Write a protein that binds this ligand. Sequence first.
Ligand SMILES: CO[C@H](COP(=O)(O)O)[C@@H](O)[C@H](O)[C@H](O)COP(=O)(O)O
Ligand SMILES: CO[C@H](COP(=O)(O)O)[C@@H](O)[C@H](O)[C@H](O)COP(=O)(O)O
Ligand SMILES: CO[C@H](COP(=O)(O)O)[C@@H](O)[C@H](O)[C@H](O)COP(=O)(O)O
Ligand SMILES: CO[C@H](COP(=O)(O)O)[C@@H](O)[C@H](O)[C@H](O)COP(=O)(O)O
Lengths: 350, 349, 349, 351
Amino acid sequence: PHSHPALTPEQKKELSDIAHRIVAPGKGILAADESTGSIAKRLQSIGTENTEENRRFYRQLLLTADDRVNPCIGGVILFHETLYQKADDGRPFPQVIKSKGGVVGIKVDKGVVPLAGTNGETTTQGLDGLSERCAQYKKDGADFAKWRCVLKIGEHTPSALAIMENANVLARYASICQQNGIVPIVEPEILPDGDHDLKRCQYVTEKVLAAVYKALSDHHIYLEGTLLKPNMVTPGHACTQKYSHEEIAMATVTALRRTVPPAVTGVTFLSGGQSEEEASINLNAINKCPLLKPWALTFSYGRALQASALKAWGGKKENLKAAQEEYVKRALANSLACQGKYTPSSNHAY
Amino acid sequence: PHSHPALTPEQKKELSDIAHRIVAPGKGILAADESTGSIAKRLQSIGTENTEENRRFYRQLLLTADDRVNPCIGGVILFHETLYQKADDGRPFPQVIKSKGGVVGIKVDKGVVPLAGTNGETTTQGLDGLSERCAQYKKDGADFAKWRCVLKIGEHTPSALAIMENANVLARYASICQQNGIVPIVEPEILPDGDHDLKRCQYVTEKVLAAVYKALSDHHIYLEGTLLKPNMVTPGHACTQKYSHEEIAMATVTALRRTVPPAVTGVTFLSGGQSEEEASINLNAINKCPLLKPWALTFSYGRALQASALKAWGGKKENLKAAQEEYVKRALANSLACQGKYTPSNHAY
Amino acid sequence: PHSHPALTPEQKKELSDIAHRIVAPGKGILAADESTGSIAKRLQSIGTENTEENRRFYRQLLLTADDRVNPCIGGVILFHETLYQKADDGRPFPQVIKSKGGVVGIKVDKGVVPLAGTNGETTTQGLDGLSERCAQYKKDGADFAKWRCVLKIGEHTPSALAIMENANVLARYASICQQNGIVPIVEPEILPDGDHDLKRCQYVTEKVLAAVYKALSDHHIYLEGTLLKPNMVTPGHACTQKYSHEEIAMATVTALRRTVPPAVTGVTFLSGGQSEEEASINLNAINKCPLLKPWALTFSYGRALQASALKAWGGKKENLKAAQEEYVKRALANSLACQGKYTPSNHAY
Amino acid sequence: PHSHPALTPEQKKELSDIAHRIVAPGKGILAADESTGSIAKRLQSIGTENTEENRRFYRQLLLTADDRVNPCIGGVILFHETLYQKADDGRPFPQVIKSKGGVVGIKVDKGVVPLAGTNGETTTQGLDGLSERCAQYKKDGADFAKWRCVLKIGEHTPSALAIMENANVLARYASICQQNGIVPIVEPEILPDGDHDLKRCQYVTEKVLAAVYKALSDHHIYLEGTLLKPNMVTPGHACTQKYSHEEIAMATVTALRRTVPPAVTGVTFLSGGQSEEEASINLNAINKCPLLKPWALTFSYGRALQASALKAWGGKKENLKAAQEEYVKRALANSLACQGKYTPAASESLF
Ligand SMILES: CO[C@H](COP(=O)(O)O)[C@@H](O)[C@H](O)[C@H](O)COP(=O)(O)O
Ligand SMILES: CO[C@H](COP(=O)(O)O)[C@@H](O)[C@H](O)[C@H](O)COP(=O)(O)O
Ligand SMILES: CO[C@H](COP(=O)(O)O)[C@@H](O)[C@H](O)[C@H](O)COP(=O)(O)O
Ligand SMILES: CO[C@H](COP(=O)(O)O)[C@@H](O)[C@H](O)[C@H](O)COP(=O)(O)O
């Protein structure tokens, strides 16, 4: 049990400062890091061709929204392509993001792959050459990263293997990021697919998060220089029992309180399949939950920040301003929610 | 994995209420749970015979001190024998304690045993018939329990085996306690023995508590109905490098923040080989640390509540008052300490 | 990872020597180690009262059967009470067993306890004071021990927790036994309860045994000085599908080949509710299975050695010889079975 | 837990048949899978330039030695480049290997990388797109693969982290291979660097192998369709105490017996820094060791099959035959060793 410090005091300070800036009071993260394949699905749903120019234009649309988003957006997550694209005025997109007060983030995973011998479970690849990629990304303006693991609640899932293997790969990814001055966002996503109830989600979330933080400990991860991107605890999409937002909040915050060490700087929730308003209301309820919550509780939203903007845009340039207006409004809503100031205007049961 | 609830909401509420009572603001725990062989050592240091009557009398002395300890003392841990002894007025000791505002605790472990294949490391025994014992203890007035694992920082210790095994047995004990409405105090003590510096203790303490909480999770422990009893993070006893109390506090609070889930109701530090004054100054510094601390940080002191009481007693019936006075002074000192009201680059941690 | 040898070369030689004697070619184990409440059930099944004297007599009946059993029986497992009883002629039962060429064994667990938050799963207790017990048992003539863990195949079982905790307590027991010159028989019994098929049993058996052997390594267990007592791999009791003895044998030996290091001296199957004949026929098929089998494959039978003897006895002293005759025939049959001499597409596994 | 078979009976049969073929009696493996950067250091030691043609030529030299090697060589491991190279007669190197009765193997790892927070310890990278790479390698003639993890004996190493992480990634790699009809050789190398003694190496080897097989079990690996490639148990290179070959063999076979399940089809030892003769004598002692050994015990040698052949070649075209003769000699020596029938540059330490 001997210490061979992974990081010097100077490196730790850098990572903690980055993580805190990202989730500073009022702020959250725009997840605009959809891969070519995944954003294709997005463009297809508004009858728009999947071209590099259309992708650049749409990302530009979000990133150059007016300065009302500035106090709302602490970080933006980009896909590799977008990190090296430019606004119309010649400015690299990372420069655009920084000029508006946002930290630049990069998605570094290479997608999920099947775990043999399991019931449709996966782990995530992307470790190969990751240190070199992170050194390069750091040099080109990124200060944090994202890696997404995916788990499913079902009859025999998540299995012990899936839990252990996904926690392990997350820790390796985190270790490599921190060696290169990159703050890792750890995403152990538990899908909402299925008809399980709220407490089954809460139980699995608690088990998954316990495994994640044990792996991070084993791999010597500096928690203060990390963020967590979990699912909210919710019933399954097909569950018949209804729950209030207060119950979703309580279950979510209880699960986190039981597993997430206080040294973690912030929890940036994924929105999953939730509508824009639903995601905002839940995040707001979570921040109003009367329990002690010793980490920032904010958003890292893809769909829940973009759904309307993508719609209003319809792939037509003249709609640019109305689409940006849709984004800014969700940005404002979620900035309020991550402070518990959003208005549409028995713990032991957990 | 599928849920098969260990506890009902009503069982959870009971355990949570107990844990919060013990560590309510300004309160800590008196650890008077020395076994026969251990208390023998105490009495020996004051030239006093180790008879049941002297044990009964010494405990009486501590437990019936005046009402100025009432707000200082949320809990009192007893050894089996004492739980069934009575004060001079005929009242069972559990009743004395309860009448003064205290929750009754019972140590239930049966001591350390060697782990073979290790360099002098141990685990702790005491699981056998534990459930039946707990049911009886509960019936006879106890609401919490204590179990002590011991780890040591050395050349090749604590080993992975020692960490894994002590964490696992602590989880088994916590689980059984909770099934019987007893709040388990989880004590994974890392000894201060040796010449290691402060950061090595911080490193080992962080690794140990990560293991403890993973094990508590695997065993479905309800954290809200548990307390943690760790060593403070300090340099080894023979460490040549010196540190301030503020550094001790920072290393300690940082270790806990990196491992102890917010759901844990309280952390009740053991005093180790710290003097009465040192133990209070450090607990005060810890509570003054500038970080967020989402659990009570208070005391479960044995020696550091008793050193001066014992010496002033000296084994003489007629020194009762002066001895009870020394105990009350340490109780008052530590009550202020766990509130940060006692006067006698964190990225580097 | 540094070695701090658990055992000297001399301690190893002793343990290995004992292990090999117990499972010498043709030899198996009589499990007569039913606890008071377990033998009670057995006695009620023949309307016989559970008194110490009837237990003594029944155990005497088995232990003093004629010398035809000597080449058959390498070891006899006893419950504590029986280790300290005497035959009619005054000879301690251990002396009896040993004059007939057998090694004396002692069951040292204290039964299963419930694991909270599981679907009816258990672990096993009995570690407290185990070292002191083993040294006394060794002094009083025992050279090996037995410890039973119990796992169940069901919807959510055996869980990760059940598998990890039972592997772990098995390793602790093994470590303590070996410190005291006692060969531990490691028994992780997977019950045949339920309607699961043969491949499900095989799968759960492989997962359980992998966990067991990893735990034994973590705790520095000297495998040459151990024996394994697993279930055979068979369909569940309620399973509607039919299998031949050859498929049971193939599944069992395949399971063992994938998990049990060659260093293990022997595998002594529990009978697990199989009839006497079925248990013998399966062991026989296991020993004829054409795959490489680098450990002795033999028996540690309770019911499959006793059922007919207990029936022929029916609690009447005068049925002594008819009773013993039934036991001797099962001893003979099983000694032949563990030699593959008893007569009353591996990639599919 | 519930079963969702990773493999069908048909797939198991194929993987089992491949594994048994590689380590059939008398047969071992030639490890010719040095990456560009490693073969370069090989060529440097003989003033030969590191060019594609020199590498191609040297590999041809080994693969086309006369037919005396056919019964000695059950498998040949190649680096990616070599897999798609051809001999002078236009035949792809895999065709050459098969025509001489050998199975074709492909190294698929992408080298070691540092584990942060450790004392100089590594894990191994190479899982990204491994499935796709394996499917392609299968199509192009390869039936097994090799992946190398590296561990080091020292004061604080191997650490719990290094052991777990390396065993886990080995399991991931084994799993992906088997999904694509490729037999994975699992190589958990414990370096002989340092001055530790025999029993320390034996202890570390037992611990590392227990972890590797637990990982493989957790990841549902089919052991009959794997091979293991461990270090032999030996004292450290700087250890002053001396041991006989019988002792090395005993410690090696004991360590294996305590950790490697009988289902594993074979154990193909790495030579490490052992001389060509040292590697053959030890391998021979191991097979003569009077304990029960339920797996084939053979070789997967790089340096210990190639040292003399490299030196005799010297990069000169005209030394073709002289080189091949040195290789054939080591191959025959080792085919006998892995049967326990072997009796004695081939003496120079290759550390
Ligand atoms: C679409 O974004 C990611 C999934 O697709 P790719 O990995 O192929 O790009 C995914 O990481 C996403 O960014 C996160 O899950 C957060 O998004 P939501 O807030 O919509 O759940
Ligand atoms: C004080 O009681 C204990 C002494 O050992 P025994 O278990 O034989 O009675 C011990 O548990 C003590 O409570 C501490 O854990 C160690 O010393 P401190 O209480 O001063 O910290
Ligand atoms: C002899 O029977 C034993 C009874 O166990 P308990 O006293 O703890 O209830 C039994 O454990 C036996 O030792 C083995 O399990 C094998 O017995 P069977 O061959 O009948 O399955
Ligand atoms: C140890 O690895 C294999 C056996 O080598 P030795 O028998 O000489 O010890 C071998 O295949 C080795 O991995 C390659 O020669 C070199 O691999 P890299 O290309 O990763 O450096």
